[PDB]
PDB file of N, CA, C and O in Angstrom:
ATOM      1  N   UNK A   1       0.843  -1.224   0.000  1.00 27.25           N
ATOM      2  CA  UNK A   1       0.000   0.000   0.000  1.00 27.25           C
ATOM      3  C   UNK A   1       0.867   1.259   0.000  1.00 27.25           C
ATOM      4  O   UNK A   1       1.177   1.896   1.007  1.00 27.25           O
ATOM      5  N   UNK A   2       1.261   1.569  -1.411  1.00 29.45           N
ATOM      6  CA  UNK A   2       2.324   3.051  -1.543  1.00 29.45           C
ATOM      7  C   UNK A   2       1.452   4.013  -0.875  1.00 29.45           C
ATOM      8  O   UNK A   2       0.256   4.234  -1.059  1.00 29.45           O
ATOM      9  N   UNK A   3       2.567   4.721   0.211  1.00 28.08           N
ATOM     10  CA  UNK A   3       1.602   6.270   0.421  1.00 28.08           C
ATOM     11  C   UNK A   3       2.196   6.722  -0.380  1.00 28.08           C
ATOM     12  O   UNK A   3       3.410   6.767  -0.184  1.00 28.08           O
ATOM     13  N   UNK A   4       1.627   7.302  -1.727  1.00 28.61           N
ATOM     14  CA  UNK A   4       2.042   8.261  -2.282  1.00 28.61           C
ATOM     15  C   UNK A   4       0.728   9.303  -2.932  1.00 28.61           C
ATOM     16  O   UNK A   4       0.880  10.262  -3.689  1.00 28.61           O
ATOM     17  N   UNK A   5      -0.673   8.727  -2.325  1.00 31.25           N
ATOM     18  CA  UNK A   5      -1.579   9.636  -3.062  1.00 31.25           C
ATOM     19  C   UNK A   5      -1.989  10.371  -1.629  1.00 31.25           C
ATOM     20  O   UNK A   5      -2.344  11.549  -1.672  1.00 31.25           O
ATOM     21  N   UNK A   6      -1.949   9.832  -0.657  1.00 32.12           N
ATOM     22  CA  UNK A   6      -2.713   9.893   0.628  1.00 32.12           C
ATOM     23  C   UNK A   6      -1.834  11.634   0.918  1.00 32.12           C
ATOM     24  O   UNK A   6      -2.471  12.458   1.575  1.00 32.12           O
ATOM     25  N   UNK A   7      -0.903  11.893   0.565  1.00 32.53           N
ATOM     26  CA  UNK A   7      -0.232  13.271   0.798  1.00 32.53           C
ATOM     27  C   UNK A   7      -0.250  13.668  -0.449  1.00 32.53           C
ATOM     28  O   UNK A   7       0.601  13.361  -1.284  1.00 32.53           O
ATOM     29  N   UNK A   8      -1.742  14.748  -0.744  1.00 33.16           N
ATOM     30  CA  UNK A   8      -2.230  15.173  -1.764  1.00 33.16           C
ATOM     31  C   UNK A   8      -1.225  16.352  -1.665  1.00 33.16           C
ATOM     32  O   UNK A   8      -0.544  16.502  -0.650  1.00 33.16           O
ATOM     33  N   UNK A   9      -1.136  17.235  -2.792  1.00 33.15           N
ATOM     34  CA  UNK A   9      -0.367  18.376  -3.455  1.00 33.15           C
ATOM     35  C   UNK A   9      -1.202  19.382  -3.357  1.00 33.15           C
ATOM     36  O   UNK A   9      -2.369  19.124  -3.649  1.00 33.15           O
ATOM     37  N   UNK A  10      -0.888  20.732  -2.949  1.00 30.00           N
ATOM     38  CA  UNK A  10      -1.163  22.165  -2.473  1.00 30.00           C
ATOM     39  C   UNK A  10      -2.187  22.357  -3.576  1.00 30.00           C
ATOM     40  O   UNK A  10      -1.772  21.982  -4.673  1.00 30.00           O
ATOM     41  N   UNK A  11      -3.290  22.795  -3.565  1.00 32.48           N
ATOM     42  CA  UNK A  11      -4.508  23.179  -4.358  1.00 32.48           C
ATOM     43  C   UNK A  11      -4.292  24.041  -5.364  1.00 32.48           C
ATOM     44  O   UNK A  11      -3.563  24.984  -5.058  1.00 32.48           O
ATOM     45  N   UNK A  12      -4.771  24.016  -6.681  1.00 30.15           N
ATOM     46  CA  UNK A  12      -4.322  25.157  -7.527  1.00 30.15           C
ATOM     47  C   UNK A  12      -5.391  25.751  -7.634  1.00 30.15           C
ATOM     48  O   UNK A  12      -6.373  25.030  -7.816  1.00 30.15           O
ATOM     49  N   UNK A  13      -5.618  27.296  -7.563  1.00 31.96           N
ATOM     50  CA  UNK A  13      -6.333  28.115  -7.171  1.00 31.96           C
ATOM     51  C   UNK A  13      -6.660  28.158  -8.590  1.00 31.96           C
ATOM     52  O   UNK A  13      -6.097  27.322  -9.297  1.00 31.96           O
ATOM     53  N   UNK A  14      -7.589  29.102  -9.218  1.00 30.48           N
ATOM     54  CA  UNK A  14      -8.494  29.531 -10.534  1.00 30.48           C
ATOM     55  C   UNK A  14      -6.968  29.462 -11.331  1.00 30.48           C
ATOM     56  O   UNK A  14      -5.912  30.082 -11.213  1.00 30.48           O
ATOM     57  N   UNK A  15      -7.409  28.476 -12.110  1.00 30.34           N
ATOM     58  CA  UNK A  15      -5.829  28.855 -13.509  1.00 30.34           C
ATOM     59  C   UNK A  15      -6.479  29.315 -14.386  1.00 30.34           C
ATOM     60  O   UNK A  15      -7.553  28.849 -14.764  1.00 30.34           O
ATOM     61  N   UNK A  16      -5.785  30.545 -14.955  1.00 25.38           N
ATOM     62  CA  UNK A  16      -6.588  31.314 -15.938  1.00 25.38           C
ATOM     63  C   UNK A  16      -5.584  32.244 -16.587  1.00 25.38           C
ATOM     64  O   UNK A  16      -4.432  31.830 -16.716  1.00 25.38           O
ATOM     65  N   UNK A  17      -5.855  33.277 -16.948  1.00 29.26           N
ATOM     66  CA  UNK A  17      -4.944  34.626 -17.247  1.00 29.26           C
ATOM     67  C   UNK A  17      -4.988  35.505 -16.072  1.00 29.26           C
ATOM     68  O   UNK A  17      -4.058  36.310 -16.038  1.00 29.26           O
ATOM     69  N   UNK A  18      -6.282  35.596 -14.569  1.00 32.37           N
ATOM     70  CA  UNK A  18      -6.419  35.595 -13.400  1.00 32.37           C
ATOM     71  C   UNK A  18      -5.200  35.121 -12.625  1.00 32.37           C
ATOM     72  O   UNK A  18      -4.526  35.875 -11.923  1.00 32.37           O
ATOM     73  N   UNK A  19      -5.002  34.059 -12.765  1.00 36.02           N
ATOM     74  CA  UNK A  19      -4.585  33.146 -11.863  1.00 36.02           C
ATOM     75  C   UNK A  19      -4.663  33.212 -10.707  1.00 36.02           C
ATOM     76  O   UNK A  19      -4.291  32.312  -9.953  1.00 36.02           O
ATOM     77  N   UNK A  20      -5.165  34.296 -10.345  1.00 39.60           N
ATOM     78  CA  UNK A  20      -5.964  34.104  -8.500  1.00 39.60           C
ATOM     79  C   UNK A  20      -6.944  34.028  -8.225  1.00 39.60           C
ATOM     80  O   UNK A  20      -7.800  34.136  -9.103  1.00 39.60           O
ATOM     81  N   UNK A  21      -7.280  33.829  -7.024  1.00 39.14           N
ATOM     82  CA  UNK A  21      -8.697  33.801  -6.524  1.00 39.14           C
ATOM     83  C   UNK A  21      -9.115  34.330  -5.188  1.00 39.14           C
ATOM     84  O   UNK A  21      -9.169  33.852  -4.056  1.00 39.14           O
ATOM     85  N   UNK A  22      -9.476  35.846  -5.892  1.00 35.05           N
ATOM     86  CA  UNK A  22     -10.134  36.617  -4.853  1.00 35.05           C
ATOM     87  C   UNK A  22     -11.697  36.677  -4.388  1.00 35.05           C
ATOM     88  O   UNK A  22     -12.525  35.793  -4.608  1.00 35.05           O
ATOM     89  N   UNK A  23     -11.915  37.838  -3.737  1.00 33.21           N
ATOM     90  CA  UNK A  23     -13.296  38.137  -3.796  1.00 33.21           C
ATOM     91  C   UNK A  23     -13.261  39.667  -3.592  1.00 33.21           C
ATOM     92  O   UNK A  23     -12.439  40.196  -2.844  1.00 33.21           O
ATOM     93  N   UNK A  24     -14.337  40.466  -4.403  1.00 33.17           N
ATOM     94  CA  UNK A  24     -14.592  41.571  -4.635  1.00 33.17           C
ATOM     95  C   UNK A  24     -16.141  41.756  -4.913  1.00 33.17           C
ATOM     96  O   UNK A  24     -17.073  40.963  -4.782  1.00 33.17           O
ATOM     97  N   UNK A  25     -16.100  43.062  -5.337  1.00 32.24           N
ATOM     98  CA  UNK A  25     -17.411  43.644  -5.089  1.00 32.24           C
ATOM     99  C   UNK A  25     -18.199  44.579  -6.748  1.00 32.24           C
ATOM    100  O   UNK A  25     -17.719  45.264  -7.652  1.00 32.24           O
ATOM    101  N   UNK A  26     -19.028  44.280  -6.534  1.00 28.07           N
ATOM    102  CA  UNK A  26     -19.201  44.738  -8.182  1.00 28.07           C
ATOM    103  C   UNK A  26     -20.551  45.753  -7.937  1.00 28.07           C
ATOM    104  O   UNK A  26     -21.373  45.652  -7.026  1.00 28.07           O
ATOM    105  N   UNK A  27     -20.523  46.784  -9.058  1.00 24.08           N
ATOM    106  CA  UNK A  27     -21.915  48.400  -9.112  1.00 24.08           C
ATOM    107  C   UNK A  27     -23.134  47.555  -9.093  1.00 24.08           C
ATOM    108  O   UNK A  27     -23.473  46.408  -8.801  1.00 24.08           O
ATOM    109  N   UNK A  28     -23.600  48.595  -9.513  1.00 24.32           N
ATOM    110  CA  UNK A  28     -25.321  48.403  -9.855  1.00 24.32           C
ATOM    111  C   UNK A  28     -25.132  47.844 -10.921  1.00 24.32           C
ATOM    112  O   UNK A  28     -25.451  46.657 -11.004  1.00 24.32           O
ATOM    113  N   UNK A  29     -24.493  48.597 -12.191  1.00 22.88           N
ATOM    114  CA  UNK A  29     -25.166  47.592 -13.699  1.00 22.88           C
ATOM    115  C   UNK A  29     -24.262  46.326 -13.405  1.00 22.88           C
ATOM    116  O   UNK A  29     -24.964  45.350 -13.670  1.00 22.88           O
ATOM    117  N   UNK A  30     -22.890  45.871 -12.931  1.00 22.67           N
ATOM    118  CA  UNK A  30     -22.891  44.639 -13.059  1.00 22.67           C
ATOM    119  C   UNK A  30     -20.911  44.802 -13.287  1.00 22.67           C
ATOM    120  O   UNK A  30     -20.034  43.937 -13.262  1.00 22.67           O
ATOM    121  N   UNK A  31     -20.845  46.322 -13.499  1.00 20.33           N
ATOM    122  CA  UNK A  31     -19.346  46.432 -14.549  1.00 20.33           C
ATOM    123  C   UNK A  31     -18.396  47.297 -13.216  1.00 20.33           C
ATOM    124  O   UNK A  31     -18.332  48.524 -13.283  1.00 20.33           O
ATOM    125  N   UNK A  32     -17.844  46.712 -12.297  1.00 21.66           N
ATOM    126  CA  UNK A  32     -16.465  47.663 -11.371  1.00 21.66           C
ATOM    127  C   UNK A  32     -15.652  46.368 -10.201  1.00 21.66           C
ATOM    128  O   UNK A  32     -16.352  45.500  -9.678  1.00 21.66           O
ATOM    129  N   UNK A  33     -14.913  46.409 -10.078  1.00 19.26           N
ATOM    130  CA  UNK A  33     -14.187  45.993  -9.106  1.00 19.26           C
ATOM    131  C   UNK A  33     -14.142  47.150  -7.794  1.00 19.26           C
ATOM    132  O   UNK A  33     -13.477  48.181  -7.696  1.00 19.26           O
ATOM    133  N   UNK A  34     -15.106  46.545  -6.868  1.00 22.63           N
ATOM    134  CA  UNK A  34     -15.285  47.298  -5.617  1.00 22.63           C
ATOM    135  C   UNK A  34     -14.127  47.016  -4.676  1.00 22.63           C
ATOM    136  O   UNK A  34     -13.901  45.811  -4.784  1.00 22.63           O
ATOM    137  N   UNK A  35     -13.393  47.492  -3.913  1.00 22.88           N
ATOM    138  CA  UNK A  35     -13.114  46.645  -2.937  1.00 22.88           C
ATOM    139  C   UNK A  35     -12.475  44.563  -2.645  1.00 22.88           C
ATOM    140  O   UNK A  35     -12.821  43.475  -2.186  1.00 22.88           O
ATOM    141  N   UNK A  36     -11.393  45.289  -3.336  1.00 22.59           N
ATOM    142  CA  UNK A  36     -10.886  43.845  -4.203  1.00 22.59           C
ATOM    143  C   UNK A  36      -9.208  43.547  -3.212  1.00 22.59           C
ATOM    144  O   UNK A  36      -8.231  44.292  -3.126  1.00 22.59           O
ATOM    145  N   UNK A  37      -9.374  42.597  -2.786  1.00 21.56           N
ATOM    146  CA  UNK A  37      -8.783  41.819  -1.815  1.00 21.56           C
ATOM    147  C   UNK A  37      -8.197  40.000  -1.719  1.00 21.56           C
ATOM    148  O   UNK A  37      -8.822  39.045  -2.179  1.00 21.56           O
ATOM    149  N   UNK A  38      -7.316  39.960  -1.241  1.00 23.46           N
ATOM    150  CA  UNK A  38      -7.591  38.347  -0.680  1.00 23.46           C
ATOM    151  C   UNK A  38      -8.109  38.186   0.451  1.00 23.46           C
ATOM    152  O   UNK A  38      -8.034  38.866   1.475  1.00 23.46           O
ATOM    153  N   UNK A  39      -9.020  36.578   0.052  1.00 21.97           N
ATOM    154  CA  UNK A  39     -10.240  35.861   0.477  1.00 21.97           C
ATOM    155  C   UNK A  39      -9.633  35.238   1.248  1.00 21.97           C
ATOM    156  O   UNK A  39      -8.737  34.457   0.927  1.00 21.97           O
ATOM    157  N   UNK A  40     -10.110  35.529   2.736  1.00 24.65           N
ATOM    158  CA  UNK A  40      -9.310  34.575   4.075  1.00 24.65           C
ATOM    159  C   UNK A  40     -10.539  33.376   4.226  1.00 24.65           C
ATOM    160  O   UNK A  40     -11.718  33.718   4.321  1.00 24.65           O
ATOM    161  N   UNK A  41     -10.176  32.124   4.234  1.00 25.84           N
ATOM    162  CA  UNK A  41     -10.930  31.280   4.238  1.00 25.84           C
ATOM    163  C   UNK A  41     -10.007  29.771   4.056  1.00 25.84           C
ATOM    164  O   UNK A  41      -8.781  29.706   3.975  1.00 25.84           O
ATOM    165  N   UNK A  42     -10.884  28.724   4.022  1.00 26.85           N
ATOM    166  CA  UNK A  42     -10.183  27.059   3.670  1.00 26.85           C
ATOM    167  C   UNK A  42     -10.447  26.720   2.588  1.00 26.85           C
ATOM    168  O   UNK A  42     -11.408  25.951   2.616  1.00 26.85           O
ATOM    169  N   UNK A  43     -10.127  26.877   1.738  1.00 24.53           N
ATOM    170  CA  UNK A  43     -10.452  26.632   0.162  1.00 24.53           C
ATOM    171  C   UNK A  43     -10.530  25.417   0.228  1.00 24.53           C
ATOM    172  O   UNK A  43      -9.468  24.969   0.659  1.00 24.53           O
ATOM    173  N   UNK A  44     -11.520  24.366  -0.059  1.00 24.11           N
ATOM    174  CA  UNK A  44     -11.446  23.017  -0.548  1.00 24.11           C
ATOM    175  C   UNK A  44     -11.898  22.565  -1.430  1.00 24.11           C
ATOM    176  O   UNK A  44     -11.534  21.394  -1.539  1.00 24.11           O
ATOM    177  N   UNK A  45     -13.081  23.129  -2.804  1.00 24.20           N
ATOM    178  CA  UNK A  45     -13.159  22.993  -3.685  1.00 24.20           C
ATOM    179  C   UNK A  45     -14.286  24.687  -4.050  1.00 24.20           C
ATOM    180  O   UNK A  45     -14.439  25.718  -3.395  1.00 24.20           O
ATOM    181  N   UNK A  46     -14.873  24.188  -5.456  1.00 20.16           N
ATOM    182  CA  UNK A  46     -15.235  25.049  -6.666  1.00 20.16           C
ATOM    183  C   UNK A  46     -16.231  25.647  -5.414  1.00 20.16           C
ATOM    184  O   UNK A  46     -15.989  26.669  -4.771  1.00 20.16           O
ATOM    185  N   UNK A  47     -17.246  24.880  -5.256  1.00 18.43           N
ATOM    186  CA  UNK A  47     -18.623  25.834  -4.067  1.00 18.43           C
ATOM    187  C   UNK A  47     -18.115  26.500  -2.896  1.00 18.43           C
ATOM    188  O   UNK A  47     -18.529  27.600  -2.527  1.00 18.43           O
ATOM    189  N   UNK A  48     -16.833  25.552  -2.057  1.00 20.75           N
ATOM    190  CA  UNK A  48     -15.904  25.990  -0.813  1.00 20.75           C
ATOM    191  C   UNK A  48     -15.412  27.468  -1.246  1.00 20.75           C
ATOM    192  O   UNK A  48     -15.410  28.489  -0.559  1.00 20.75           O
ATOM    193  N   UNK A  49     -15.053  27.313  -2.396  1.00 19.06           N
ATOM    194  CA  UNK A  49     -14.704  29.524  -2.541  1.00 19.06           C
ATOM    195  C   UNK A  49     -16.264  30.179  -2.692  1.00 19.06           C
ATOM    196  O   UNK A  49     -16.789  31.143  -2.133  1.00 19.06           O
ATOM    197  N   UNK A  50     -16.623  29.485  -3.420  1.00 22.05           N
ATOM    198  CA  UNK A  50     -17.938  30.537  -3.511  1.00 22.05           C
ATOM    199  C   UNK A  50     -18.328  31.134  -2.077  1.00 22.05           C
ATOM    200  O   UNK A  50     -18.523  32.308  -1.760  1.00 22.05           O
ATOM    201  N   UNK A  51     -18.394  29.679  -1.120  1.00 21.82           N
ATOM    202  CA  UNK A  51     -18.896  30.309   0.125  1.00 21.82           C
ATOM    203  C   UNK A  51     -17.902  31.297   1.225  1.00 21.82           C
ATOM    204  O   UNK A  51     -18.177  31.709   2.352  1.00 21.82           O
ATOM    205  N   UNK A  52     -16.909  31.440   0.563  1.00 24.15           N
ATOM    206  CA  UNK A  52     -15.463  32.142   0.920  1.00 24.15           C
ATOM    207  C   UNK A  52     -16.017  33.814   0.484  1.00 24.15           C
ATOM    208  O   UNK A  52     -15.263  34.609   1.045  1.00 24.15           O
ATOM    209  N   UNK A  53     -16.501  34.140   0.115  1.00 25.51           N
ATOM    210  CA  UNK A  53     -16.920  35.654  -0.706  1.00 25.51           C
ATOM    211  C   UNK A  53     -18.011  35.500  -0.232  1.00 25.51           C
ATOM    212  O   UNK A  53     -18.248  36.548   0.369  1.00 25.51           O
ATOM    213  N   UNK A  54     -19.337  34.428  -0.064  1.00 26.08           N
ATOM    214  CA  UNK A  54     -20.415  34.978  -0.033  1.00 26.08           C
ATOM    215  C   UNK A  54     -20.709  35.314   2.142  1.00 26.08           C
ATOM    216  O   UNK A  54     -21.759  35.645   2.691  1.00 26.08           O
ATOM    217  N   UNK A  55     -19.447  35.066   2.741  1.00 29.71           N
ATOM    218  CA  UNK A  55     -19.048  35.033   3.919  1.00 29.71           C
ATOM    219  C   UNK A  55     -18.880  36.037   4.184  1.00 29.71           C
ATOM    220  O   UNK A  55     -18.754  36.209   5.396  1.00 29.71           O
ATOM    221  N   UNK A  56     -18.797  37.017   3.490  1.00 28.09           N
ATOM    222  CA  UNK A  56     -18.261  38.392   3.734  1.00 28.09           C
ATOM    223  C   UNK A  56     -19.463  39.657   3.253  1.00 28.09           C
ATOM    224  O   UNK A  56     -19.588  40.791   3.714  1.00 28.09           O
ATOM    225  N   UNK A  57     -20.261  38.962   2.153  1.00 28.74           N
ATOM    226  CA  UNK A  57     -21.015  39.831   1.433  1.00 28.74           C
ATOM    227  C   UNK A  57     -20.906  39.911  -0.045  1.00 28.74           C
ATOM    228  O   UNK A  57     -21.739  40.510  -0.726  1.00 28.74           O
ATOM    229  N   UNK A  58     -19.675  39.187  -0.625  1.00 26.73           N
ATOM    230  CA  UNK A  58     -19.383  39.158  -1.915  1.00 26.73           C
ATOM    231  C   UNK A  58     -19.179  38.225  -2.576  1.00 26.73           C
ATOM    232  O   UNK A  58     -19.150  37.106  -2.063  1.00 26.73           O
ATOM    233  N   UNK A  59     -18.941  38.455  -4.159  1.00 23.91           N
ATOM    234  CA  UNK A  59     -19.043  37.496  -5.090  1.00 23.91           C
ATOM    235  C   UNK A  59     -17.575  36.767  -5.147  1.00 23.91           C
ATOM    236  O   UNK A  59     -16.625  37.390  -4.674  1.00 23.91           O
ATOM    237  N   UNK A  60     -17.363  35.498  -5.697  1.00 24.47           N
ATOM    238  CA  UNK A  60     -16.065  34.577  -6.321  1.00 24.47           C
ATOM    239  C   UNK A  60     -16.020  35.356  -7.783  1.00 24.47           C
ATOM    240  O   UNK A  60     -16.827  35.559  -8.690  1.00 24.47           O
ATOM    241  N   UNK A  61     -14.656  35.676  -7.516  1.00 21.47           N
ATOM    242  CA  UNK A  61     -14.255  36.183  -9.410  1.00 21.47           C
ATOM    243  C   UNK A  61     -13.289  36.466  -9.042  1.00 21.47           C
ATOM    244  O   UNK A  61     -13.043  37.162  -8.056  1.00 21.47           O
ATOM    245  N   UNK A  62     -12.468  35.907  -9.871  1.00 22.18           N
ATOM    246  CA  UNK A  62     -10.961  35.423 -10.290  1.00 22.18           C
ATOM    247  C   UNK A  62     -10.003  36.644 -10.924  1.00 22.18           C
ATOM    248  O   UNK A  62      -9.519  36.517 -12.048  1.00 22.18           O
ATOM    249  N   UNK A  63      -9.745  37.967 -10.020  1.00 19.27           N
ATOM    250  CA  UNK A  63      -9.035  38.842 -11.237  1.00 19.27           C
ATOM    251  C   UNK A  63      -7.572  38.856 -11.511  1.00 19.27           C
ATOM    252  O   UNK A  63      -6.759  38.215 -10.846  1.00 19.27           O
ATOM    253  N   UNK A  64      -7.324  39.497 -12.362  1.00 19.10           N
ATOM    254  CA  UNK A  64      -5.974  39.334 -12.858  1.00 19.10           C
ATOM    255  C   UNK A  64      -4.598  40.979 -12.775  1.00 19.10           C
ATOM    256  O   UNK A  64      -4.774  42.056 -13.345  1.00 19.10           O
ATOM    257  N   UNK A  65      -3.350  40.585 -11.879  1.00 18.74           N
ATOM    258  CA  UNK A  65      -3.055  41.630 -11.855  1.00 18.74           C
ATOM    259  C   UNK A  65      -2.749  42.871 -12.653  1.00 18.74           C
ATOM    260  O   UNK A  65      -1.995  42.876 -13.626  1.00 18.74           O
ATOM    261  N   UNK A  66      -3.315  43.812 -12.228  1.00 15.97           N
ATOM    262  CA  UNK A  66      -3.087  45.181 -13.133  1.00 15.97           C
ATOM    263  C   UNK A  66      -1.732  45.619 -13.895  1.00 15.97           C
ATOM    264  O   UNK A  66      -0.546  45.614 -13.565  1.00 15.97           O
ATOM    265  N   UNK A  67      -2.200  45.876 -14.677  1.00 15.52           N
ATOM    266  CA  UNK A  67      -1.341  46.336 -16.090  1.00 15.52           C
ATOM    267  C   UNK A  67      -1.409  47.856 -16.778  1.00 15.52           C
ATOM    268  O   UNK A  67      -2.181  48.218 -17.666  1.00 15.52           O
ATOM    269  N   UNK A  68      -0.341  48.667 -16.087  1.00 12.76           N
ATOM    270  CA  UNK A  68      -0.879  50.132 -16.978  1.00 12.76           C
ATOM    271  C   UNK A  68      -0.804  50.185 -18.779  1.00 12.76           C
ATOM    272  O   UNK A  68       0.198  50.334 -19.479  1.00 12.76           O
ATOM    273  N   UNK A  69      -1.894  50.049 -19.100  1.00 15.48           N
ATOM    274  CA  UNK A  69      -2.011  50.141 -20.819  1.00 15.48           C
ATOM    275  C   UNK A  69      -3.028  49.317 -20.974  1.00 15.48           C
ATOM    276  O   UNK A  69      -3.201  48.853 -22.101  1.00 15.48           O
ATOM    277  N   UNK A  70      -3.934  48.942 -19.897  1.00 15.93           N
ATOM    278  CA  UNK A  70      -5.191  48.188 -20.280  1.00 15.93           C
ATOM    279  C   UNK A  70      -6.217  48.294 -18.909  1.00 15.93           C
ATOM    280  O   UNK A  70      -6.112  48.670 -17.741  1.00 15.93           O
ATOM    281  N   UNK A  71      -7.216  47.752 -19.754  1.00 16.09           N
ATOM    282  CA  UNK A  71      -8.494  47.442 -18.391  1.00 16.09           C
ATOM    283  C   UNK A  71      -8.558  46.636 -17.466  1.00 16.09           C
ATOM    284  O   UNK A  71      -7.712  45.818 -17.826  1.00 16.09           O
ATOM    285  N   UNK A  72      -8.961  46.268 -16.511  1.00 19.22           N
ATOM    286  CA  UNK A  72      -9.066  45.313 -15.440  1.00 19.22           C
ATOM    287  C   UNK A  72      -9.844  44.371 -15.762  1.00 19.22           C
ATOM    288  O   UNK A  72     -11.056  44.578 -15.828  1.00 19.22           O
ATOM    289  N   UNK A  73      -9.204  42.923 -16.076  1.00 16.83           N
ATOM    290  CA  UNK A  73     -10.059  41.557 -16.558  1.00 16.83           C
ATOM    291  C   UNK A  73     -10.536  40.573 -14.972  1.00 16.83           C
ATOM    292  O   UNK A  73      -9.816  40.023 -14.140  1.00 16.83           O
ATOM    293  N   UNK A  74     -11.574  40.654 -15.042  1.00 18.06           N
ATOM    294  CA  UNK A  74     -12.419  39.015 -13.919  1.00 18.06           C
ATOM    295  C   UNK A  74     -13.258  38.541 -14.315  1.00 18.06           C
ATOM    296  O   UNK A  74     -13.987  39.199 -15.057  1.00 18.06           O
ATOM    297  N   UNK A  75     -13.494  37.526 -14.097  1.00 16.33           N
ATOM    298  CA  UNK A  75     -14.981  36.400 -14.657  1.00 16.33           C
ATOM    299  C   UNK A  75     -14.743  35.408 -13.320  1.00 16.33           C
ATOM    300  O   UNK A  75     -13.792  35.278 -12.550  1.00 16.33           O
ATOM    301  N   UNK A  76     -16.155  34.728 -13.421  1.00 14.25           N
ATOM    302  CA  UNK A  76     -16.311  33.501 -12.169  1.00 14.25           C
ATOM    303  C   UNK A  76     -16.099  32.355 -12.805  1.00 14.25           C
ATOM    304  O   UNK A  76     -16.871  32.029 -13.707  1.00 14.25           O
ATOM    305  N   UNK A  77     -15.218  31.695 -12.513  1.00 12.44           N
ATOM    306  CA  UNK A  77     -15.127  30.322 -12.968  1.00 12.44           C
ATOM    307  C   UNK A  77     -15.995  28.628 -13.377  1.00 12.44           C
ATOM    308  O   UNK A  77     -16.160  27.750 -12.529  1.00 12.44           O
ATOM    309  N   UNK A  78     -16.341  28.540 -14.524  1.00 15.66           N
ATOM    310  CA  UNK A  78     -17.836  28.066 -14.853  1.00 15.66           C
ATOM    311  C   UNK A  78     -18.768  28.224 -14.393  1.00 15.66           C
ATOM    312  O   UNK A  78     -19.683  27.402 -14.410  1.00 15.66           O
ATOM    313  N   UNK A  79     -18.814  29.551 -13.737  1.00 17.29           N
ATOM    314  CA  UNK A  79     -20.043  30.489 -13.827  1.00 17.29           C
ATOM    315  C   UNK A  79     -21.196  30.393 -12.374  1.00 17.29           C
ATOM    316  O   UNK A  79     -22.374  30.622 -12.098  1.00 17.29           O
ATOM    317  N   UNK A  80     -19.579  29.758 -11.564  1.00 16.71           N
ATOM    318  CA  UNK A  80     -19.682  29.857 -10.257  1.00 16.71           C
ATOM    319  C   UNK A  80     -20.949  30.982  -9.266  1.00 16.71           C
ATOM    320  O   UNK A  80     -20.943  30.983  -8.035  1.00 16.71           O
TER     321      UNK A  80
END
């Protein structure tokens, strides 16, 4: 009986052009990054973040760090 699965490997957070996984806050029509932070919580899977943001008051969406010469990209991960 190899232990070799039983000591699983560090979780990979949203892989994307994101590649993190925060939680933030979005306007009325639907379009701003409010108040955009890392999500203190136990990540253990796809719903486990959702309920990581909705713990606080906010949504799961994955943004990506800022770049002067463009806009600020996030989306929720299959639509989490």
């Amino acid at each position: 009986s190899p232990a070799a699965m039983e000591r699983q490997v560090p979780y990979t957070p949203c892989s994307g052009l994101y590649g993190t996984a925060q939680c933030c806050a979005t306007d009325v029509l639907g379009v701003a990054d409010l108040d955009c932070a890392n999500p203190p919580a136990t990540l253990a899977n796809a719903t486990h973040f959702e309920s990581t943001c909705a713990a606080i008051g906010q949504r799961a969406r994955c943004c990506v760090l800022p770049i002067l010469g463009q806009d600020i990209l996030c989306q929720t991960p299959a639509g989490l």
